[PDB]
Design a protein around this nucleic acid. Structure first.
Ligand SMILES: Nc1ccn([C@H]2C[C@H](O)[C@@H](COP(=O)(O)OP(=O)(O)OP(=O)(O)O)O2)c(=O)n1
Ligand SMILES: OC[C@H]1O[C@@](CO)(O[C@H]2O[C@H](CO)[C@@H](O)[C@H](O)[C@H]2O)[C@@H](O)[C@@H]1O
Ligand SMILES: [Ca+2]
Lengths: 415, 553
DNA sequence: TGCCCCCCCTTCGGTGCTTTGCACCGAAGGGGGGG
């Protein structure tokens, strides 16, 4: 007896028509078991080829999780679904969530299955489960309730969500709660023991609605301990000709961000035509230029601030030895945040795992800090990334990415 | 009494009406054979005759079946297909025998007139109108509309293919001991039952399909091996492809070469070591489909090498899920790679080859990674898991590559196999400048209008050179200037350029390239013992960079 | 002189940085195969 919220597409756009990519045996077995149980419970229904729309589907396992989790690559549908900020169903972003000492993430996506979907919109949620060795043609399904991973599911359900959270937000007014896609970010400044206690209260607080992948898992963040990676000039005494050449190349690049950087008195040290390993002293005018340039790299970049109407963009640089640097920006050279990762899972043996782990780490930070997911510039070939990333993905969301190939002519973010 | 096959709702694209294409002239031999087949469809109820209220029409023709005495009726629905709604094809790929598991009982079935046994959408039959001449357009003739799925409509395969699954769905759930490979009307049914209990379930399936209007004639019913399935031959323990016909024509046209490479690619799934590089290299160019090409010395030898492979009959084995999958790749040279997938030694499940040349400058390590990725996708399609790899590359060679590459690259669980030729990096750039090596400050320049340019270097020991170049670009001179530094330097040399373009190519350690200049640079680097490359910005008064930029500009 | 799917090889035009040359890529047209 619940009326369905009518949903339209962006005018001038069709539905998603993305082909299903091959799936491993263990993921197909997980999906068939899940798509059979969801068919018994009427949450999904079989369709035919007359539905011209399709969206990829596969399964994942979250961190320290042993049971599979269905994940649908709704990236094409979300881009083509009407932005619910125009419908005013958008969720405001609390600027204090990044200031809490602890933030627990809860997968509340299972509650979306209780709300029906607009009938005229169900044809856009079509997906196809493949078969191993193409034994069976595509078994196509579509959604009848709010699907997990669609950007409209938390927007429609937010009206119901604000009611379920009312008693807990009033008994604990210092706890900040943010909702993004299937996740619920709960942040407090309490002790870790009292934080997890309030988290367990929030779980049992949701069970009181469940009676009237699962909710038991939670992942602890600490945004107050997040640090940034600035551009740094190395400290040396005996600079070789090649040392100053690399430094001048680095400073010249950095001048695109810090316009006060000068290199006139350092370039004149490279006046002659000397061997790369010849040690040269630092002139008096060059000593001040290097010291003055370090001070410019200390102060912040002028005029950098987050525009909520602009897309976030993230670049990543593979530095080797398990080191990975990244920068989040909206306009070029106006970086909102720079950082570095190290000793991630897969260090010194699997790059694709680390890059997949770093994309998840960056995306999680962008959700906590701005409530958005950035578009990634991944330092990897297209086929290399498309072959393995699904084997190491552990999140319920999937960011947008393009592929780049920029050799490191100037080691800029890491010495 | 047969249960109705539920009609699939079919629409046209918005704001589009049905087709009106009339009919092209047809020869009398075809017009006569058509009226006989159409009368058979009126008898069985597959085609209605009434349509004076129907302004639509689609052209019709007829070609014979493959090596059969029966003509096949086809309708050119290309105008209807443009105006019909889009379908999502449920056919995602082709089944392969190397993914089959051995069974004790096997049967092959084929539904008769399969498209004509599924009721078309009621409101859509008006747009399937078509005319046929009675006697050379002397009299008007018989008009008809399709009451079932026709042949030539873009939705006919997908509709029948999904409808076939709905009919088999209750049978497969109530018989989990059975495996059914459905591909259009072709049906492969295998089980580990007594082949008598198999014949029972097969007849149960024959009646169950006959309970929805799908006939299974005995002419297409295969009960005894070898089972001709998907263009293969299925024996109880092994499988092989149906025989391959190589055209032995002594005057090769472009279309002959295209047919040759196509059949070699098809045979390369089970016949190991098939090459098509030198043969397809004859095909490159803007030549017409009929131009005669003389086979080059390398292409004739490569064609002879393929003849030797296809002389001996080769077979594959079936998939045992209890054993691991093994994939072993061999380098064939000139960017060619073959591989075999097996579970027990010398018993290949299937073979294949990767000869794709992506990028203007590459090396064997990249091509091997691309080959591993092609195998991984293929294996997950066929068996749903990634095979253990046996690669002709040493662990130290791979570790040196992926740790130092700026891009993220990775190969799954793999072990080294000493099967020459081995894949290796032919040179490696030092990370730090070389003490005691001459430092070559290098630069080039070219005029955008005259296409003239100069390229040269200046070293710390006083050595200099400038060379004028004609019909050149800024990028070529920058490459040409590095080439001069490599030629006139000792075994160890430091090279400082300002060319981001040239430095990006060389730092990727290519061993092969489409550019004659890059290859000569590669040849020089392999001769060297220590090479250090460094980049500095231009027009900043740096070292010899300002000195050499003036000499070239 | 039809339809749908998969594969490889070559060509060609669009796209974005190596920049107005050069490189990459997806579409398309040739072939093979299946029903
Ligand atoms: N050149 C071809 C061959 C086949 N098919 C499609 C339409 C057929 O319905 C289906 C199955 O092919 P068959 O040769 O088995 O034809 P029917 O199954 O149509 O006839 P038969 O009684 O010979 O089995 O494949 C097609 O469109 N074009
Ligand atoms: O890796 C990109 C790859 O994915 C495809 C299909 O899987 O498209 C998906 O990814 C795109 C890149 O973000 C999205 O734009 C798109 O919505 C999503 O379906 C292919 O297009 C592409 O080859
Ligand atoms: Ca048939």
């Amino acid at each position: 007896p619940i009326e369905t919220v009518p949903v339209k597409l962006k005018p001038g756009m069709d539905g998603p028509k993305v082909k299903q990519w091959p799936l491993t045996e263990e993921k197909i077995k997980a999906l068939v078991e899940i798509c059979t149980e969801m068919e018994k419970e009427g949450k999904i229904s079989k369709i035919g080829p007359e539905n011209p729309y399709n969206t990829p589907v596969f399964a994942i396992k979250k961190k320290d999780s042993t049971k599979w989790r269905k994940l649908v690559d709704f990236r094409e549908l979300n881009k083509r679904t009407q932005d619910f900020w125009e419908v005013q169903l958008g969720i405001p972003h609390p600027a204090g969530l990044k200031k809490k000492k602890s933030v627990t993430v809860l997968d509340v996506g299972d509650a979306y299955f209780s709300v029906p979907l607009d009938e005229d919109f169900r044809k856009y949620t079509a997906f196809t489960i493949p078969s191993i060795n193409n034994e069976t043609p595509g078994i196509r399904y579509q959604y009848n309730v709010l699907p997990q991973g669609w950007k409209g599911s938390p927007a429609i359900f937010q009206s119901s969500m604000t009611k379920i959270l009312e008693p807990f937000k009033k008994q604990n007014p210092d706890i900040v709660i943010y909702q993004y896609m299937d996740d619920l970010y709960v942040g407090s400044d309490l002790e870790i023991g009292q934080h997890r206690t309030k988290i367990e209260e929030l779980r049992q607080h949701l069970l009181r609605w469940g009676l009237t992948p699962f909710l038991w898992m939670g992942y602890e963040l600490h945004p107050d301990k997040w640090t940034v990676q600035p551009i740094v000039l190395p400290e040396k005494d005996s600079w070789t000709v090649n040392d100053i050449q690399k430094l001048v190349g680095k400073l010249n690049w950095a001048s695109q961000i810090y316009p006060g950087i000068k290199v006139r008195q350092l370039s004149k040290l490279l006046r002659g035509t000397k061997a790369l390993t010849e040690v040269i002293p630092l002139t008096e005018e060059a000593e001040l230029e290097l010291a003055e340039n370090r001070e410019i790299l200390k102060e912040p970049v002028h005029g950098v601030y987050y525009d909520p109407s602009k897309d976030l963009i993230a670049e990543i640089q593979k530095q080797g030895q398990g080191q990975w640097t990244y920068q989040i920006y909206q306009e070029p050279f106006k970086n909102l945040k720079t950082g570095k990762y190290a000793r991630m899972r897969g260090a010194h043996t699997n790059d694709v795992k680390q890059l997949t782990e770093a994309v998840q780490k960056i995306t999680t930070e962008s959700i906590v800090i701005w409530g958005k997911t950035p578009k990634f510039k991944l330092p990897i070939q297209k086929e290399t990334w498309e072959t393995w990333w699904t084997e190491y993905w552990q999140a319920t969301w999937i960011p947008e990415w393009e592929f780049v190939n920029t050799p490191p002519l100037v080691k800029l973010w890491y010495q | 009494p047969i249960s109705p096959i539920e009609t699939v709702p079919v629409k046209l694209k918005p704001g589009m009406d049905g087709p009106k294409v009339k009919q092209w002239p047809l020869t009398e031999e075809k017009i006569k054979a058509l009226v006989e087949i159409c009368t058979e469809m009126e008898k069985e109820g597959k085609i209605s005759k009434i349509g004076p209220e129907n302004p639509y029409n689609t052209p019709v023709f007829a070609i014979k079946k493959k090596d059969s005495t029966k003509w096949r009726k086809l309708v050119d629905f290309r105008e209807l297909n443009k105006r019909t709604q889009d379908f999502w094809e449920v056919q995602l790929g082709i089944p392969h025998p190397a993914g089959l598991k051995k069974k004790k009982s096997v049967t092959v079935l084929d539904v008769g007139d399969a498209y004509f046994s599924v009721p078309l959408d009621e409101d859509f039959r008006k747009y399937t109108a078509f005319t046929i001449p009675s006697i050379n357009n002397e009299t008007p003739g018989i008009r008809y509309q399709y009451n079932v799925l026709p042949q030539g409509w873009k939705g006919s395969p997908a509709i029948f293919q999904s409808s076939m699954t709905k009919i088999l769905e209750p049978f497969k759930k109530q018989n989990p001991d059975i495996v059914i490979y459905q591909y259009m009307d072709d049906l492969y049914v295998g089980s580990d039952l007594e082949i008598g209990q198999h014949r029972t379930k097969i007849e149960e399936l024959r009646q169950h399909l006959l309970r929805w209007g799908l006939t299974t004639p005995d002419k297409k019913h295969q009960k005894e091996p070898p089972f001709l399935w998907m263009g293969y031959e299925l024996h109880p323990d092994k499988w092989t492809v149906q025989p391959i016909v190589l055209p032995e024509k002594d005057s090769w046209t472009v279309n002959d070469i295209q047919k040759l490479v196509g059949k070699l690619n098809w045979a390369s799934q089970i016949y190991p070591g098939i090459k098509v590089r030198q043969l397809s290299k004859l095909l490159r160019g803007t030549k017409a489909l009929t131009e005669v090409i003389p086979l080059t010395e390398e292409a004739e030898l490569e064609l002879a090498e393929n003849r030797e492979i296809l002389k001996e009959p080769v077979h594959g084995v079936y998939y045992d899920p209890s054993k691991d999958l093994i994939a072993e790749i061999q380098k064939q040279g000139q960017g060619q790679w073959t591989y075999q997938i097996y579970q027990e030694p010398f018993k290949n499940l299937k073979t294949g080859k990767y000869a794709r040349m992506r990028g203007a400058h590459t090396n064997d390590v990249k091509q091997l990674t691309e080959a591993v990725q092609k195998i991984t996708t293929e294996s997950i399609v066929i068996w749903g898991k990634t095979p253990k790899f046996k690669l002709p590359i040493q662990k130290e060679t791979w570790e040196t590559w992926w740790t130092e590459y700026w891009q993220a690259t990775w190969i799954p669980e793999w072990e080294f196999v000493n099967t020459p030729p081995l894949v290796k990096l032919w040179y490696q750039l030092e990370k730090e400048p070389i003490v005691g090596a001459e430092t070559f400050y290098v630069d080039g320049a070219a005029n955008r209008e005259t296409k003239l340019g100069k390229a040269g270097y200046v070293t710390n020991k006083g050595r200099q050179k400038v060379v004028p170049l004609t019909n050149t670009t800024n990028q070529k001179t920058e490459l040409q200037a590095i080439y001069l530094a490599l030629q006139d330097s000792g075994l160890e040399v430091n090279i400082v350029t300002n060319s981001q373009y040239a430095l990006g190519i060389i730092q990727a350690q290519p061993d092969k390239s489409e550019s004659e200049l890059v290859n000569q640079i590669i040849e020089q680097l392999i001769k060297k013992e220590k090479v250090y490359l460094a980049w500095v910005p231009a027009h900043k008064g740096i070292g010899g960079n300002e000195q050499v930029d003036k000499l070239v500009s």
